[PDB]
Amino acid sequence: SSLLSESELPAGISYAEAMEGGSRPLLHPDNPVVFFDISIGSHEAGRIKIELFKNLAPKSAENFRQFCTGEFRQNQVPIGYKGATFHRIIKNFMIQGGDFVKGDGTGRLSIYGSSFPDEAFVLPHFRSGLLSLANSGPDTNGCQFFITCAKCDWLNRKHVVFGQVLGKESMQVVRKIEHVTVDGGNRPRIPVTVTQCGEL
């Protein structure tokens, strides 16, 4: 099994280590670090910085990275996470977003085509603050993602964990998003938007 147990994890990805992170990667020196500036309704909430684990999940990292910088063009139009939202929020579980196509969880597009396969399932969903791919079954990754708000190992081997948030502010912003009021479908009553994003 490629899935690492929690005692076999590489240096740089414990909660304590990630919370001491700045704007440079902790797991491998060539990992990109990207950011989202988040607004909740009309209220700026702060910035989430995210290390993408190119060393473990290069295709997943590069897809997310291009959607952060606006580098990817669809029909010659840049498309990505700027203006995208967190459309499904479940307190004590995770925050899900990145559906820039439809804004509701139905959208799927990647830099590789409509979907892309699962990379190796190396890391478990062992703690809060991890970035993982949303999908609709095997080999259906696209643009959506989630950030864990708790341990959620029942997702292991079904979703590729491909990044981690860096620094205390990042987690504070995640927790703010996690606690917004939601409707019966777990959709926030006031939109949670990536107003700006890019690479550090």
Binding site: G105, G137, G142
Partner: peptide
């Protein structure tokens, strides 16, 4: 329940 799908969220 507590999955993270894209299209038909299950229980």
């Amino acid at each position: 329940x507590l999955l993270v799908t894209a299209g038909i969220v299950l229980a």
